[PDB]
Coordinates of C-alpha atoms and ligand atoms in Angstrom, one line a residue:
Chain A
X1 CA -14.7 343.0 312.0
X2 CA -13.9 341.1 308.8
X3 CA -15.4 343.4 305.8
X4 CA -15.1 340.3 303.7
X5 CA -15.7 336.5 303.0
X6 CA -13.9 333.6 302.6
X7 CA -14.7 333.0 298.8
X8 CA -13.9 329.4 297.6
X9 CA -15.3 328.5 294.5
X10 CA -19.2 327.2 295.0
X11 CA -18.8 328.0 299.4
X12 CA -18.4 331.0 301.3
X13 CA -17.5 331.4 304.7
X14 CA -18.8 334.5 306.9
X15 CA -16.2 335.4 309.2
X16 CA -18.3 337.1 311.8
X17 CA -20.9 335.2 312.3
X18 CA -19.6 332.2 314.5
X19 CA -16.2 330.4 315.1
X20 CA -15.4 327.9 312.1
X21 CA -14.8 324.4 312.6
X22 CA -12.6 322.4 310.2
X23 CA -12.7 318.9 310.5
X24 CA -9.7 316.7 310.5
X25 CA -10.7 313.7 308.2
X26 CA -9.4 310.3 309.0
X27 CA -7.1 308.7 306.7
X28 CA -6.4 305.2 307.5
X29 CA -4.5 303.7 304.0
X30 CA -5.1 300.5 302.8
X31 CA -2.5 298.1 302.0
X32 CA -2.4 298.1 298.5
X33 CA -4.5 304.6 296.5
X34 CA -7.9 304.5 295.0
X35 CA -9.2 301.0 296.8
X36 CA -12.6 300.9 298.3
X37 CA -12.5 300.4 301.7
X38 CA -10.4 302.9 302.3
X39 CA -12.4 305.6 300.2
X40 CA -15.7 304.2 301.8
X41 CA -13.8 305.1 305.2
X42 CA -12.9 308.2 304.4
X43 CA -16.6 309.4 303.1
X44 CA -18.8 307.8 305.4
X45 CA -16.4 310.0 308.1
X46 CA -16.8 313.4 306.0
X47 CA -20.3 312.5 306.2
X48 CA -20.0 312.1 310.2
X49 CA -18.5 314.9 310.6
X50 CA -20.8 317.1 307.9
X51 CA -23.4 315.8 310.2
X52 CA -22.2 316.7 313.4
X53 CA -21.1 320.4 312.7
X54 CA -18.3 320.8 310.4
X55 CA -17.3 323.7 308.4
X56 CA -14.2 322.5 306.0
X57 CA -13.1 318.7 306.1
X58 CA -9.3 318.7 305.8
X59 CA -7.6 315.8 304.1
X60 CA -4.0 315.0 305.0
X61 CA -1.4 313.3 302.6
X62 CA 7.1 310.3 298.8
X63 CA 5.6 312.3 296.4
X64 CA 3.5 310.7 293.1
X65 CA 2.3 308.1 295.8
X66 CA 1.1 311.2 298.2
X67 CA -1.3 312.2 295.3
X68 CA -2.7 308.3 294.4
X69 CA -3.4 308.7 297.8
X70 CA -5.3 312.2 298.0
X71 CA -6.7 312.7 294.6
X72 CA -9.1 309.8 295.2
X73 CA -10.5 310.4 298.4
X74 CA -11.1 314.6 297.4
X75 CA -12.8 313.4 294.1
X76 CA -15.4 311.2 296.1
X77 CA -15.8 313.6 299.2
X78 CA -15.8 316.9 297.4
X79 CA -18.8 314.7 295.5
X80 CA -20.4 313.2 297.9
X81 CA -20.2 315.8 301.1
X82 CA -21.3 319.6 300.4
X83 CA -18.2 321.2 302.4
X84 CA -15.4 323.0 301.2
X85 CA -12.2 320.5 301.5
X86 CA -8.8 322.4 302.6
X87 CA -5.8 319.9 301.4
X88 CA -3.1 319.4 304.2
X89 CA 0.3 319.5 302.1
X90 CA 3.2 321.4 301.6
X91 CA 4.1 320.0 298.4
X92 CA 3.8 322.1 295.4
X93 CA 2.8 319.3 292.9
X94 CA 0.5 317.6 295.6
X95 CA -1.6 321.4 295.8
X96 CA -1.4 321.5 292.6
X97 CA -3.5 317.9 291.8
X98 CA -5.8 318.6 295.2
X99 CA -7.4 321.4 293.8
X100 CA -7.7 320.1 290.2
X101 CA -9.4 317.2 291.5
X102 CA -11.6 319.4 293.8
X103 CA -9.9 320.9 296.8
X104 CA -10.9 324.9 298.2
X105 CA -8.0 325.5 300.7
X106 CA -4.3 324.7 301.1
X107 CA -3.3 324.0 303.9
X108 CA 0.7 324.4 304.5
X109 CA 2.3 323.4 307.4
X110 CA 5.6 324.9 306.3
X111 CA 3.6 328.5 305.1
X112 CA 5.4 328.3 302.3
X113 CA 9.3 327.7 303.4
X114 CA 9.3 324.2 302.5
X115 CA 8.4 324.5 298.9
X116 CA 7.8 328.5 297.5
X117 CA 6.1 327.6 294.6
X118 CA 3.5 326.2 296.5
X119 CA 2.3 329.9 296.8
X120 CA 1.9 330.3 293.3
X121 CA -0.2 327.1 292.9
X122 CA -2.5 329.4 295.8
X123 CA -2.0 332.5 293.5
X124 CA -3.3 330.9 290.5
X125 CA -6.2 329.0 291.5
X126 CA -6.7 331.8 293.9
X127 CA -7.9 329.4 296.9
X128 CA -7.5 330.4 300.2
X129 CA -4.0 329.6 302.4
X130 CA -3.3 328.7 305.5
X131 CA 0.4 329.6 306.6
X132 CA 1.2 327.9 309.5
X133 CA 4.2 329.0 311.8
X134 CA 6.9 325.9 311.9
X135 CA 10.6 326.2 311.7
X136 CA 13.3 323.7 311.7
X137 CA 15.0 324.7 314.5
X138 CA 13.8 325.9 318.3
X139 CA 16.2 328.5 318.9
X140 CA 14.0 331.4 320.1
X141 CA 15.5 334.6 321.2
X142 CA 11.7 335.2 322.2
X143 CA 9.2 332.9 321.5
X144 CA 6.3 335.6 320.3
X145 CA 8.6 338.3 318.1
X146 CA 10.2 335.5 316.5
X147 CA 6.8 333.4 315.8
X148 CA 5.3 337.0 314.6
X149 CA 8.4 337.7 312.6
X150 CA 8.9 333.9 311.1
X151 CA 4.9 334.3 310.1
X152 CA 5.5 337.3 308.3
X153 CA 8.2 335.8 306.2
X154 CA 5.5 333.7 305.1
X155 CA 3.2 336.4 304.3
X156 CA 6.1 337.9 302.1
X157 CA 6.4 335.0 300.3
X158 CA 3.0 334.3 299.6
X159 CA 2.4 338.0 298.6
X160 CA 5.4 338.0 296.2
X161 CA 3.7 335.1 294.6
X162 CA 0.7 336.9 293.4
X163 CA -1.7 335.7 296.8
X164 CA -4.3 338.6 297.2
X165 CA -4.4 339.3 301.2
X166 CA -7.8 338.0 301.4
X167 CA -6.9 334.9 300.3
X168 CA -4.4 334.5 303.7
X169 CA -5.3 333.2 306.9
X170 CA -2.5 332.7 309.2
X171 CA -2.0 329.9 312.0
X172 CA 0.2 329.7 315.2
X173 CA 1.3 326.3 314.6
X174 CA 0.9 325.0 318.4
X175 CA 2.8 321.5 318.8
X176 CA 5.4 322.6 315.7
X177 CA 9.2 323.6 316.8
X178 CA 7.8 324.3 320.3
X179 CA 8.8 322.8 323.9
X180 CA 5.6 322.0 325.5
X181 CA 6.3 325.1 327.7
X182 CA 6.7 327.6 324.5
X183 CA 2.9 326.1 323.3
X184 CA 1.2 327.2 326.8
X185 CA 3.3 329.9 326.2
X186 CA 1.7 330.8 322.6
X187 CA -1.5 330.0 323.6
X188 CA -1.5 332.3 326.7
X189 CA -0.4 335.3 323.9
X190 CA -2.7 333.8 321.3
X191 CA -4.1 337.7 320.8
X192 CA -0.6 339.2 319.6
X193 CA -1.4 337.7 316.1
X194 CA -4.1 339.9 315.8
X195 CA -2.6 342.3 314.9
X196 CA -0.8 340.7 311.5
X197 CA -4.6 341.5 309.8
X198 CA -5.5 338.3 309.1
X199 CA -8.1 335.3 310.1
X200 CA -6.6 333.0 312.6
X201 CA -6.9 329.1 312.5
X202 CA -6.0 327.4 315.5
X203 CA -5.3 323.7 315.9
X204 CA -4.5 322.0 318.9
X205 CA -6.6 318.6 318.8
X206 CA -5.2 316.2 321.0
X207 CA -1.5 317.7 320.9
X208 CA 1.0 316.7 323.3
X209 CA 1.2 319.5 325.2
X210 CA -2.3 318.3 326.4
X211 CA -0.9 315.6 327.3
X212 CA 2.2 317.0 329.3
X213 CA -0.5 319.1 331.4
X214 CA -3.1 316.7 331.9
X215 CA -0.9 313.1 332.0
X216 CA -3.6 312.0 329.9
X217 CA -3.1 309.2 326.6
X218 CA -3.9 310.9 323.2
X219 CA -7.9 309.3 323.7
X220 CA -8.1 311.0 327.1
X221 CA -7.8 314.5 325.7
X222 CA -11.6 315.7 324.8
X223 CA -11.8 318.2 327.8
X224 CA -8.1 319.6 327.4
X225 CA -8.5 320.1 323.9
X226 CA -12.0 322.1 324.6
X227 CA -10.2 324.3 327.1
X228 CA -7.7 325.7 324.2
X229 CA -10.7 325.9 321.5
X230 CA -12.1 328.1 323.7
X231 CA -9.0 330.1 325.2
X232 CA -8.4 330.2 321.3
X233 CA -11.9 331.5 320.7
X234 CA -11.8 334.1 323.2
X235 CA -8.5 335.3 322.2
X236 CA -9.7 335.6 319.1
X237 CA -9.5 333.2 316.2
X238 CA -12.1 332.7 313.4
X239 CA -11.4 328.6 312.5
X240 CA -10.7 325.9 315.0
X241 CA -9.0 322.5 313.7
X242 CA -10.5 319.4 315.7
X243 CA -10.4 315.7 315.5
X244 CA -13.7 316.1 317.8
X245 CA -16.4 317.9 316.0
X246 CA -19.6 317.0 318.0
X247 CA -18.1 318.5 321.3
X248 CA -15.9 321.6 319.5
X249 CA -18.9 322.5 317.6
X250 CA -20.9 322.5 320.9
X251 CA -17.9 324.2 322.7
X252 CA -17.1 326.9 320.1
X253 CA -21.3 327.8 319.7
X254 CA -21.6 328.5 323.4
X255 CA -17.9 330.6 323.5
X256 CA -19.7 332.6 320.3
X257 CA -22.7 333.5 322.3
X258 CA -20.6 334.5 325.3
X259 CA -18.1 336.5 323.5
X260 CA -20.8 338.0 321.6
X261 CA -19.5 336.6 318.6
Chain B
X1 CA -2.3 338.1 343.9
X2 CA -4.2 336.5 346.8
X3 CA -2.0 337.1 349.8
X4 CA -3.6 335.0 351.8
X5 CA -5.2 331.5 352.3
X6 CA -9.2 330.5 352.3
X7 CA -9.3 328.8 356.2
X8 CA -11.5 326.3 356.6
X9 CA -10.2 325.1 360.1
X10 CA -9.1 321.7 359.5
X11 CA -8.5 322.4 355.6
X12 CA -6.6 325.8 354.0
X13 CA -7.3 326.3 350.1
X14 CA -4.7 328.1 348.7
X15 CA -5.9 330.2 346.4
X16 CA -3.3 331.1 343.5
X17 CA -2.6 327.6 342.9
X18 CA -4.8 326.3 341.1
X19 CA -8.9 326.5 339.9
X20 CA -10.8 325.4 343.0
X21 CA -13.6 322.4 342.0
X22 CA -17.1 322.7 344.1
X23 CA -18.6 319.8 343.4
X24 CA -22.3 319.7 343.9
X25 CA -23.7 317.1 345.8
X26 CA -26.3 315.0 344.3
X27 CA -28.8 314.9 347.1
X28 CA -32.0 312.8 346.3
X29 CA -34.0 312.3 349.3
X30 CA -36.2 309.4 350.6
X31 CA -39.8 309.1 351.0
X32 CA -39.5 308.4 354.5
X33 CA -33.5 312.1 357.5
X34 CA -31.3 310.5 358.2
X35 CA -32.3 306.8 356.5
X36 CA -29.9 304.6 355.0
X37 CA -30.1 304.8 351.5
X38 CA -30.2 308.4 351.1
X39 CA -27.1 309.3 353.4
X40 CA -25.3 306.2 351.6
X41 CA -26.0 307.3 348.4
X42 CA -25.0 311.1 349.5
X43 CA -21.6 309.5 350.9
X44 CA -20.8 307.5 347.5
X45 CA -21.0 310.7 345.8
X46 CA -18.7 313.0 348.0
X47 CA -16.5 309.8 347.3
X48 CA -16.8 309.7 343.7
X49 CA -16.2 313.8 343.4
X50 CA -13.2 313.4 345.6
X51 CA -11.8 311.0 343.9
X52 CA -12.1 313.2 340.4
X53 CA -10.8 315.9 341.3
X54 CA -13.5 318.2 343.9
X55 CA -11.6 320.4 346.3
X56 CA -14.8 321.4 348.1
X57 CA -18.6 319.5 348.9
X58 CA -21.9 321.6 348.4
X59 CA -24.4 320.1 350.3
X60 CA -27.9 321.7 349.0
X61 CA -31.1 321.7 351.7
X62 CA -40.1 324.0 356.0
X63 CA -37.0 324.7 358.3
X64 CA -36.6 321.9 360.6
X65 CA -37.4 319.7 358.0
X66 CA -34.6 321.2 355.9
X67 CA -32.1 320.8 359.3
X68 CA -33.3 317.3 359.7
X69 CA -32.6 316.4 356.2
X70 CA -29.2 318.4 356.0
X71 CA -27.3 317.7 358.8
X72 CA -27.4 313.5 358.7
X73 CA -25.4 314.1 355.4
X74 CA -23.1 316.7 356.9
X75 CA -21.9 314.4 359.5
X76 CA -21.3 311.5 357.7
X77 CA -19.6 312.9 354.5
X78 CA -17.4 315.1 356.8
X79 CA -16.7 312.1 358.8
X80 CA -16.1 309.8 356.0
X81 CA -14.6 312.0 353.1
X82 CA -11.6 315.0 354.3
X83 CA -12.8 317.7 351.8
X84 CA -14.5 320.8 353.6
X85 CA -18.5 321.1 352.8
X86 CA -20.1 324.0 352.1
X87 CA -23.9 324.5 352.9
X88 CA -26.5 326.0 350.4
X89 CA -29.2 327.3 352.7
X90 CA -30.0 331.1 353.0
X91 CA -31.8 330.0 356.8
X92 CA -29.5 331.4 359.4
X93 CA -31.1 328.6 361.6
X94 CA -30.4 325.7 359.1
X95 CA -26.6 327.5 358.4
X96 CA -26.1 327.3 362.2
X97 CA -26.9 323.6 362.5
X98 CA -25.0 323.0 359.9
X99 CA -21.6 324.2 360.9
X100 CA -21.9 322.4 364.1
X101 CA -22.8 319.1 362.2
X102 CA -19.1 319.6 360.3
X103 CA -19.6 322.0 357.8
X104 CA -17.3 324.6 356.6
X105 CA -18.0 327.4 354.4
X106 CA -21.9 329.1 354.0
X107 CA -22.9 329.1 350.6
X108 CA -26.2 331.7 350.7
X109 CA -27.9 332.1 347.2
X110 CA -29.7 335.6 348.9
X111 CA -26.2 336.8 350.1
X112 CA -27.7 337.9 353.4
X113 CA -30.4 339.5 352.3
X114 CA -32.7 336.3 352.7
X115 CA -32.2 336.5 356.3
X116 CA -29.7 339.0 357.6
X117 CA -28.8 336.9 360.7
X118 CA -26.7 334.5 358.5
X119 CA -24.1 337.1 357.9
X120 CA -24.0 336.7 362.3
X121 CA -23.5 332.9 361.7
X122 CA -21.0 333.3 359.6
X123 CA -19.1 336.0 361.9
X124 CA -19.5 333.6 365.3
X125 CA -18.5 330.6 363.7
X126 CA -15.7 333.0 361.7
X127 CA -16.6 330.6 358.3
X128 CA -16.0 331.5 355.0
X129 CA -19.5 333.0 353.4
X130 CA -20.1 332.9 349.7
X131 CA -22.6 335.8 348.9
X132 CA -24.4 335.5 345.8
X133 CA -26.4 337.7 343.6
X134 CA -30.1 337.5 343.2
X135 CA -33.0 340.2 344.0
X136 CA -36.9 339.3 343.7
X137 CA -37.3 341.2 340.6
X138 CA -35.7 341.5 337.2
X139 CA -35.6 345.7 336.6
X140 CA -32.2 346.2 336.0
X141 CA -31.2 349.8 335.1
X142 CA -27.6 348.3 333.9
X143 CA -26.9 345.2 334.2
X144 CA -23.6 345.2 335.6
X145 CA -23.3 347.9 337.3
X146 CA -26.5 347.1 339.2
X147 CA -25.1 343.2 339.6
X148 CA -22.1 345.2 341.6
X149 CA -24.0 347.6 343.3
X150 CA -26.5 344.6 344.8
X151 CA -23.1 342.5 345.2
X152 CA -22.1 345.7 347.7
X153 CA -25.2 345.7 349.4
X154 CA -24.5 342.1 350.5
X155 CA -21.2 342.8 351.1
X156 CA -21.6 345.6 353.7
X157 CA -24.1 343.3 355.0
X158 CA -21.7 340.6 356.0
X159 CA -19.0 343.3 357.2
X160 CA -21.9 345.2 359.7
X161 CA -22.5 341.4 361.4
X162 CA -18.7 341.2 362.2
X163 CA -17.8 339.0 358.9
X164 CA -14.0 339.3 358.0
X165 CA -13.3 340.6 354.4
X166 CA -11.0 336.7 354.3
X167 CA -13.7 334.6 354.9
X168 CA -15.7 337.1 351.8
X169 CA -16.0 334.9 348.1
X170 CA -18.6 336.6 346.1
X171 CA -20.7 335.0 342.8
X172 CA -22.5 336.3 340.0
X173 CA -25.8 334.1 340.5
X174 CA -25.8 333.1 337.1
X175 CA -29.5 332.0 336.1
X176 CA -30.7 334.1 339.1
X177 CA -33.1 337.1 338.4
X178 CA -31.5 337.3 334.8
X179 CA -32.6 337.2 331.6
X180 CA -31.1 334.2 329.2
X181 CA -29.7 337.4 327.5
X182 CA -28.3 339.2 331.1
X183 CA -26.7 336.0 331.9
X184 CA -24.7 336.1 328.8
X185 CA -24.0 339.4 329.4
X186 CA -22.7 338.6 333.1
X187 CA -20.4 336.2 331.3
X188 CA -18.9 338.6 329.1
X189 CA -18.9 341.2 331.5
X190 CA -17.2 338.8 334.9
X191 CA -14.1 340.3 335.0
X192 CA -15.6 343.5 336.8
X193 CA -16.6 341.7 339.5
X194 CA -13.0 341.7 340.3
X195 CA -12.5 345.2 341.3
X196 CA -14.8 344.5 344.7
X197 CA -11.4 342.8 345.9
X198 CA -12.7 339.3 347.1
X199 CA -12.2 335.8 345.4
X200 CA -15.1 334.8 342.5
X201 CA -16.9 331.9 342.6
X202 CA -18.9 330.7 339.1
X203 CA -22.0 328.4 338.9
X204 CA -23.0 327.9 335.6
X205 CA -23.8 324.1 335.8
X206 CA -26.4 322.6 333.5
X207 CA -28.1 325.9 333.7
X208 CA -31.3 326.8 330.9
X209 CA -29.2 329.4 329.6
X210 CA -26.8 326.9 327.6
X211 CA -29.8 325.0 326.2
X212 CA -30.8 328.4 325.4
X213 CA -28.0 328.8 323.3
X214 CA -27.4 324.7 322.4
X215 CA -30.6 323.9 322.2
X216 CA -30.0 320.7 324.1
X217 CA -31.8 319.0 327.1
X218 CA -29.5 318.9 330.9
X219 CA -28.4 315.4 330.7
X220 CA -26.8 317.3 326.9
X221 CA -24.7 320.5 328.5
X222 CA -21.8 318.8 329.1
X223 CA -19.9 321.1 326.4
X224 CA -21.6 324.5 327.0
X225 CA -21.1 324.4 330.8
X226 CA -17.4 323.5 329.5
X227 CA -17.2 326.6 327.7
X228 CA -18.9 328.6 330.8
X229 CA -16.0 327.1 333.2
X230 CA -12.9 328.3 330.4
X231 CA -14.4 331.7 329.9
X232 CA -14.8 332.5 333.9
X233 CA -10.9 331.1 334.4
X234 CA -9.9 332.9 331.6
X235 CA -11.6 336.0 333.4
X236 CA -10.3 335.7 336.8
X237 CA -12.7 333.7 338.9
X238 CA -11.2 331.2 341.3
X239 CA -13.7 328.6 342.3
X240 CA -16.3 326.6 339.8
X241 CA -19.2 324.7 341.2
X242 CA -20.0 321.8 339.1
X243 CA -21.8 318.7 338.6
X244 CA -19.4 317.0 336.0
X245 CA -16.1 317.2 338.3
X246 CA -14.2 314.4 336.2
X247 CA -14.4 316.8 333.2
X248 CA -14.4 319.9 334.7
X249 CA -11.5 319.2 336.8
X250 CA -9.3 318.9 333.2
X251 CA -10.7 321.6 331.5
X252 CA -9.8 323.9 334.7
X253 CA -6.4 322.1 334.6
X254 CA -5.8 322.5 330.9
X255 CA -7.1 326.6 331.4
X256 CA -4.5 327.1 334.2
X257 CA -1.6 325.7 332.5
X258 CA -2.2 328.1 329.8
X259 CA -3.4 331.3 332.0
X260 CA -0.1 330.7 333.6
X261 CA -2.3 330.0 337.0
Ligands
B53_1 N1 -3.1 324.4 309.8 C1 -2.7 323.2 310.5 N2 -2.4 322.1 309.8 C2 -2.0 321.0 310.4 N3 -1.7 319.9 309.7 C3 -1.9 321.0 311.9 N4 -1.4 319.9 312.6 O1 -1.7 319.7 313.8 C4 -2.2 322.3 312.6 O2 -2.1 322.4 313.8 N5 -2.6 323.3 311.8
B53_2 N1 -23.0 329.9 345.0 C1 -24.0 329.3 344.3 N2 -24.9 328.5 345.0 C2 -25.9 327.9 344.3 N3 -26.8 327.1 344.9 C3 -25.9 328.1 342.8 N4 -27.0 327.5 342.1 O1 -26.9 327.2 340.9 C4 -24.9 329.0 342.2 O2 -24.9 329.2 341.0 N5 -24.0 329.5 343.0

């Protein structure tokens, strides 16, 4: 199905063999970038997560301040934990410093509408991208053309940039300029973006929406968050984005073996 | 797409509402019927399920032993919790005894091949009867296609002893007469069973085929039987017979919000 792999720099990722899981890392500040405890935190929970079954660790960021914050906590990880570490920003100059300081994957929130030249920090150090479908608006004339279309925009842009197609993977952006009805909504249609070509990376880990379904407090939302890894799985996508990575990776390895994945 | 109810004479499950949640009732017996503690600690459970979400009881049984056993719990769980019970017992004798003690719905792991004069039970007492697959051997020519051929077997069965095609719910017998391999294959593969017209019931609980795959004791499947109860949603079936109903109960929650069930 995928005639390639995810290349990024010393890691590869197979794309066939099983469902992905990126691990969202924890990033409690301290206050007063750099400090110990809060670099401490931050490894000894890549190292959880490592150990319980994670693929990628992704490490979330005013803008100098953003990168005090990052830098610090990539240079230790990317050192200390033997995963590849996709960098949650959509700030050119913030990419930029994440990967020179040891970051494999961007991960863009905006897919490259917030800040263009983000695409040619991608193109030049020729990391893999994840454009994620947001908008700043929620004005759909229909919810799955327009997400389809908006993503596409994104795909231009990155393209135009220099990003080499294998280098894309796309992502619905579930709980971003969505009522909670339009996210069940893209969920239940999940398949449609399919047929853009590229890897899909879903993340719905503890989301609202969950929440709206269930009535259930943002701790309470283990076994709704498992139902849309595996709708997500069946439908289709190659990387999952959970908070949980114990119960996702046991989730997403019994959907592979079902699916025949 | 059902257009019509599942009677169980005091209680009607509707069937497009919702996921239906058989919870599977914990029946460890005394050395020593009918005594205290076991019947107490058999109520306390139908309690506990109710309370987290079951819709339906299944009450699990040398045949007058088995009646003697069966039937103490039947009456006081019908009497004491308002959910309808279905009995697990292939003996036409122990399924007769058993309806007359309060219980609704047969649940026959031999789909009436066991004993063919449960299928008359069923008709007489005009009680819902779920047939499931097994056979005594494991030569399967195609797998699926045998599973539906058996499935009809049992089937005309029922409708030869007088059984209406409403009171009709078939099941897969996952981990019956199947490989670990065939019973991944039955997963992938459920959605056929709906072309034989009748309501689906799954019961994938804790089964060795997910520790196949996890590699993880029962008291460990939490996850994988998870994954097991999104897949069959996601492929059409309407009932799930479970163990864990707290969890199960949000994960077939969270799958119909997103189905659009
Ligand atoms: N790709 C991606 N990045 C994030 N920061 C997300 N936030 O929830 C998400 O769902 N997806
Ligand atoms: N229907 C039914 N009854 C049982 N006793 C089962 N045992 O696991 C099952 O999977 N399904």
């Amino acid at each position: 199905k995928w005639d390639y792999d995810l290349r990024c720099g010393e890691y590869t990722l197979n794309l066939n063999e099983k469902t992905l899981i990126m691990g969202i890392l924890n990033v409690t500040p301290d206050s007063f970038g750099g400090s110990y405890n809060e670099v401490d935190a931050a490894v000894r929970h890549a190292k959880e997560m490592r150990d319980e079954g994670a693929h990628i660790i992704d490490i979330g960021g005013s803008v100098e301040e953003e990168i005090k914050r990052v830098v610090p906590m990539i240079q230790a990880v990317s050192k200390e934990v033997k995963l590849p570490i996709s960098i949650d920003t959509y700030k050119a100059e913030v990419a930029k410093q994440a990967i020179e300081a040891g970051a494999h994957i961007i991960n863009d929130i905006w897919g490259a509408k917030a800040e263009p030249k983000i695409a040619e920090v991608a193109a030049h150090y020729d990391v893999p991208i994840i454009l994620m479908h947001n908008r700043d608006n929620m004005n759909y004339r229909n919810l799955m053309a327009d997400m389809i279309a908006d993503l596409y925009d994104s795909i231009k842009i990155a393209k135009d940039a220099g990003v080499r197609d294998e280098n894309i993977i796309l992502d619905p952006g579930i709980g971003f300029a969505k009522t909670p009805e339009q996210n069940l909504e893209a969920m239940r249609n999940l398949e449609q973006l399919n047929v853009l070509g590229y890897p899909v990376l879903l993340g719905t880990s503890r989301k609202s929406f969950i929440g709206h379904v269930l009535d259930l407090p943002v701790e309470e939302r283990l076994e709704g968050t498992g139902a849309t890894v595996c709708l997500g799985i069946e439908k289709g996508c190659e990387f999952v984005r959970v908070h949980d990575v114990k119960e996702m990776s046991r989730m997403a390895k019994m959907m592979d073996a079902m699916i025949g994945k």
